[PDB]
Design an enzyme around this catalytic site. Structure first.
Site, PDB file in Angstrom:
ATOM      1  N   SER A  63       0.805  -1.225   0.000  1.00 24.01           N
ATOM      2  CA  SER A  63       0.000   0.000   0.000  1.00 24.01           C
ATOM      3  C   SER A  63       0.832   1.266   0.000  1.00 24.01           C
ATOM      4  CB  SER A  63      -0.935   0.044   1.221  1.00 24.01           C
ATOM      5  OG  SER A  63      -2.006  -0.914   1.162  1.00 24.01           O
ATOM      6  N   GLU A 101      -4.891  -7.754  -5.939  1.00 18.48           N
ATOM      7  CA  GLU A 101      -3.847  -8.527  -6.595  1.00 18.48           C
ATOM      8  C   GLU A 101      -2.420  -8.029  -6.308  1.00 18.48           C
ATOM      9  OE1 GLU A 101      -6.768  -7.535  -8.140  1.00 18.48           O
ATOM     10  OE2 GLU A 101      -7.701  -9.531  -8.331  1.00 18.48           O
TER      11      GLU A 101
END
Length: 265
Positions: free
Chosen positions: A42, A142
Site C-alpha cells: 500500500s 492482486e
C-alpha cells in the site's frame, strides 16, 4: 555497525529487510538491500495521491465519485461505509493515505485513468520523477500477492525514498498540493508501530505503511529532527520462508527505525 544490526534483525525475524535514507548535508546515505526489489503493497498510495493532485485543479478534490458493492474487494475501512453516498476525490485521498483504504486507492487509479485501470499512468508519474525502477501492474487485492522475487508491483527502498523526497521535500508538487499530501501522511492512523515507534517523540514523523502476503511489511516516512532537519526513511520487508501466509512483523520495522534514529540523533 549498522549493516551488522540489520543482518541480525533479518535472522531474528526470518526476514529480508531493505532500508534507505538519502544522503543529506552531513550524513551519508544509509543503505541495506536498498536496490533490491520489494513489493510496494500500500505504500504506492502516497505517490498515487500525488499523481492525482498533480493531474487536476485543486477543486477536483470536491468531485463526487460513485461506486458499488462489487468495488469492495480489499480492506476498505472508510469506503465500505459510503457506497450509497459516494466519496469525493478528497475523501478518497484522505482514506487511501490515512486508513490505507484499498477501494479508495482503486478508485483513484481509475480517476488517473488510462490502460491497466490507471496502473500504467501511475507508473508514468513515477517515471516523470526519474524513477526508472518501480512498476505497478495490478490494483487491490492482486498487487500484494506476487510471489517473492517477482518484479510485478515492486519498488526498491532507494527508488521509493527518492520519490517521497521529491514529493514532500522537493518541488514535484506545487506548495498547496504538497501541503495536502504532507498533512494526510502526518495524520496517518496505521503507522504507530513502525517507523514512528523507532523515533523519539520530539521528532515529527509522517508516513505511509503497506502490508502484504509472504510476511510483507513496509513503511515510508519523512521525519524531522527537533530542530527541523528532515530525513526520508524507507523500510521494506518480507518473509518468503513462511510462505503466502507468513505473518508480517511490524517489530522488525520498529527495530530497524530505532537503529536508523540512533544514527541520525
Amino acid at each position: 555497525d549498522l549493516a551488522d544490526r540489520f543482518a541480525e534483525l533479518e535472522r531474528r525475524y526470518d526476514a529480508r529487510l531493505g532500508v534507505y535514507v538519502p544522503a543529506t548535508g552531513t550524513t551519508a546515505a544509509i543503505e541495506y538491500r536498498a536496490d533490491e526489489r520489494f513489493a510496494f503493497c500500500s505504500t504506492f498510495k502516497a505517490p498515487l495521491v500525488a499523481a492525482v493532485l498533480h493531474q487536476n485543479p485543486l477543486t477536483h478534490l470536491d468531485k463526487l465519485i460513485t461506486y458499488t458493492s462489487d468495488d469492495i474487494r480489499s480492506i476498505s475501512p472508510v469506503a465500505q461505509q459510503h457506497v450509497q453516498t459516494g466519496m469525493t476525490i478528497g475523501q478518497l485521498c484522505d482514506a487511501a493515505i490515512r486508513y490505507s483504504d484499498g477501494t479508495a486507492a482503486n478508485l483513484l487509479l481509475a480517476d488517473l485513468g488510462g490502460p491497466g485501470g490507471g496502473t500504467a499512468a501511475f507508473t508514468g508519474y513515477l517515471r516523470s520523477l526519474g524513477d526508472t525502477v518501480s512498476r505497478l501492474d495490478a490494483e487491490a487485492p492482486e498487487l500484494n500477492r506476487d510471489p517473492p522475487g517477482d518484479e510485478r508491483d515492486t519498488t526498491t527502498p532507494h527508488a521509493i525514498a527518492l520519490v517521497l523526497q521529491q514529493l514532500v521535500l522537493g518541488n514535484a508538487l506545487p506548495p498547496d498540493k504538497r501541503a495536502l499530501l504532507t498533512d494526510w501522511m502526518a495524520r496517518n492512523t496505521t503507522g504507530a508501530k513502525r517507523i514512528r515507534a523507532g523515533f523519539p517523540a520530539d521528532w515529527k514523523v509522517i508516513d505511509k505503511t503497506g502490508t502484504g502476503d509472504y510476511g510483507r511489511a513496509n513503511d515510508i516516512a519523512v521525519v524531522w529532527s527537533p530542530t527541523g532537519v528532515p530525513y526520508v526513511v524507507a523500510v521494506m520487508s518480507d518473509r518468503a520462508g513462511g510462505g503466502y501466509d507468513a505473518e508480517p512483523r511490524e517489530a522488525l520495522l520498529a527495530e530497524a527505525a530505532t537503529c536508523v534514529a540512533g544514527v541520525l540523533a
